[PDB]
Amino acid sequence: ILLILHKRIIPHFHTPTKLMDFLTDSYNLQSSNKNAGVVPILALNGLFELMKRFNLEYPNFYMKLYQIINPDLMHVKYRARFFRLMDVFLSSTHLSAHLVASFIKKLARLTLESPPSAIVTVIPFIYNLIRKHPNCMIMLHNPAFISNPFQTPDQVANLKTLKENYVDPFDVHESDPELTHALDSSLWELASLMEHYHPNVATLAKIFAQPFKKLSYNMEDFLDWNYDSLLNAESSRKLKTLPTLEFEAFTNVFDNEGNVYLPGVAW
Amino acid sequence: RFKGDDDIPYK
Amino acid sequence: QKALPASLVPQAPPVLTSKDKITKRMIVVLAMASLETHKIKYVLLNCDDHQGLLKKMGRDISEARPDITHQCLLTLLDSPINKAGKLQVYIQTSRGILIEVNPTVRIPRTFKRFSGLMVQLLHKLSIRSVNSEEKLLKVIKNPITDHLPTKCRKVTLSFDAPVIRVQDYIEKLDDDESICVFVGAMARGKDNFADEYVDEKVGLSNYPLSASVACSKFCHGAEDAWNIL
Amino acid sequence: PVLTSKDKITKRMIVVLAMASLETHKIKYVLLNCDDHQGLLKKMGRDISEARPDITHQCLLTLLDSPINKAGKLQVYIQTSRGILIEVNPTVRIPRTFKRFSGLMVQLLHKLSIRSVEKLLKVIKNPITDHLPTKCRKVTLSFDAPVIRVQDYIEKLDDDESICVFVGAMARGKDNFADEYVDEKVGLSNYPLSASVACSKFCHGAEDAWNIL
Amino acid sequence: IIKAYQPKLAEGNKEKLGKFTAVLLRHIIFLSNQNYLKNVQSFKRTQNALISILKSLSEKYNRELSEECRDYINEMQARYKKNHFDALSNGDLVFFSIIGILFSTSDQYHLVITPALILMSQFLEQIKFNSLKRIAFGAVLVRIVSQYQRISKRYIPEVVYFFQKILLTFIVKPLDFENIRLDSYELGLPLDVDFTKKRSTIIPLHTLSTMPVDQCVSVLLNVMESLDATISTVWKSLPAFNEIILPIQQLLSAYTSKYSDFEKPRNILNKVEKLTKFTEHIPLALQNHKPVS
């Protein structure tokens, strides 16, 4: 019902506003059943349609949107739809600075425990959000903590004491994105992704160190990726070359039940 | 882009 | 503690030009440049390569050394202050010719190609870029004073003048103003060539200084004073 | 007193002009130059880009004309790319013109020493380390290295120590010529520096640091 | 066979022995698939000789070996698509390890390591890991990927996701970790487990095919030992160490609370507290660009 509501049901009603109770309940659904956790994602599309047509406000909407973002989101198949709805929601001109920072900080928090395909999806997404909202650029770079060669010795001493007393103020459990204090935090997680094993994913993570000369990134070029695409890419390598072997020799490869390559694995 | 002690090209 | 600006991307600082007078800048005048041409093809007169010819002209070949100007230009042009776009160079030839040097230029490092550029400049009165977008070297109308910034301090390098600290000097000067240095590229001569324009003459050290060294030593003071790095 | 390799106790500023492209070629022996000899070096198979002894002449000129040389606190060593190491007496007044500099270098390389009446220019046996002061710090000029204030660097070092600076006169090449002897590499300015400016850039700070004036 | 068909004997012998570098590799992996619990010591002897021979063949014929190695990777990928973990066997764990022996594991890109590492990342994440047999497979997988990055020390998110579920699997939820997706709730370790006896942390592979509480504990300790090593090598240098170890720290805190006697959760926690204390968590600065002339 919720999948087809936005297209095949809402337009055909005389007074579609009466659905708001049903969509509000659907959008606020919280159940122990894992399969029922995807319901709020679907209700958002139909819910958003009602606001757009009749100019309706769901009490404190962007909080619930911030709440919905969770580890299951990047793995469910309906991520693309819910990401498409993001581009409409986060393109509005009145979003507060703390709001977008909380979205970016939590998304960066999630990209740590995410597959490379999800990381490939988020990293361009965070880039556009920062570009759309330059005041969130503090998260990538805080200038007060820079060590400048010309800074006088007292400034060095103040920086050292400031460095010692700093504490990360981002609250992961606070459900209010405007109160998470994410804007005062920094995105070490994206800097962590810079050392990602995959050279391409690392390259996309290295981009934040590089200047933001590009205006925006097309999500369609990064949304459609998965583990399977990476292996299919390597399954078909255009170039073939002699590999670089190990000069070092290991007497045995696994451990027993001289030199062992794999301690803790018995033979 | 010329840099450092590089000299202008000689033709 | 502060949110970053709208655009942090570094952009090339504006290329200073004689037309612009407001911006604080560094002016170095390589006064008394010994640059002369003569048909043998025209060649820049040199103390060593040409000795009989300058004797015929009756000019003392001790004052026939353009390489001193070359090294001063080389050390001056490559200074980081030029890379920061805070220095613009003038050359007053011994004949009375004033040459404006655009900071963007890249003069040849070798002297032989340098001589070829001077003779082209002196005869054609201007030099055009390889890409043909700007005139890097252009001869301009004397006096120097009109070209200089409206508010500017003038000083010369005088061995006999009191020794000063370049860094302390530049700090105590105002910001909106600019500073001009008139350096004597001559091998040996009296330091009164810029007396008419200058108001006070300063010495950079007690021991004698070479022209290139004084230019290099002076500009380091501005970069430290102005934090050019 | 004039500083010499024999004396090691006195604190001094050592500048090593590594990768110096000085070579003598006879058709009479003459210093190879990028511009003077283009066809000949094309026959030799070497690119004309790395055939520029002008850079060493410029670096020597600024270094020898630098204040600290006048104050008797600087000695210069030149390591030729071929493997020839040259010591420069601080008292020398090298020719200001390049053509006469080339004629001096060919005399030095063949005669192994210049005598005018203590060798002004003397070719000496490698390695550099044995000639250098016993207690001394070594650094190289690296653009990629962190930018450090030359003045603030010198004061924080000790007093009995001396400082060696290895500057590459090469037109183009990797900054690993002196990696084997050096312990750390530093950056002098934020923008790329030529060898002459770096030598001029460095010496002025030591004059400020040591109050040479 | 090598002696009978050396390069010098005739033309084309070079091309042949290249194909035997390939065939030897398949035989080496095939023998691992075969049952060997009866004569593990002898089967050890025959193996290391064969691997030693394959090393000599690879030194001369690395190209043919890589071609077979990539064909195997393509083959195992296809077998994973239809059979999922039932495709996996002991020989696969042998295969990826021989790759580590015979190929430059510490490269940004390699012809065989990169597919092997990305392929290993899939089993760590895609697979359900709902059985002790399956969990034993991942622990061996985690060991190989860790030493694939022993010098490179690159970050693998699938390594983080793996410990979180396995650690939570043996504590089943506590109702405090809802962000971790479990696939089996019936593998929770009983409370009566002693966790004071000296239990060997080594996992036999011949038992892997055959697959009680003791075996679960040994697998848990081996996984935990890999977790402690991963903290001590990779995550400590990573700028986000504090946030990486926070979910793990909460799980480890649960391990201590439920099992006070169990010492491994306390030790790893103590080292974590030491690293967090020393590591200076400063606001990140990455946009500082070099001025342009």
Next chain:
RNA sequence: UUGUUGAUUUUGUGGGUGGUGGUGCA
């Protein structure tokens, strides 16, 4: 295999060397 000759080469695998070098000395 040779410019008619006869195991000198030819094919494949391994494989070291600046060496009709120059120059200064005793």
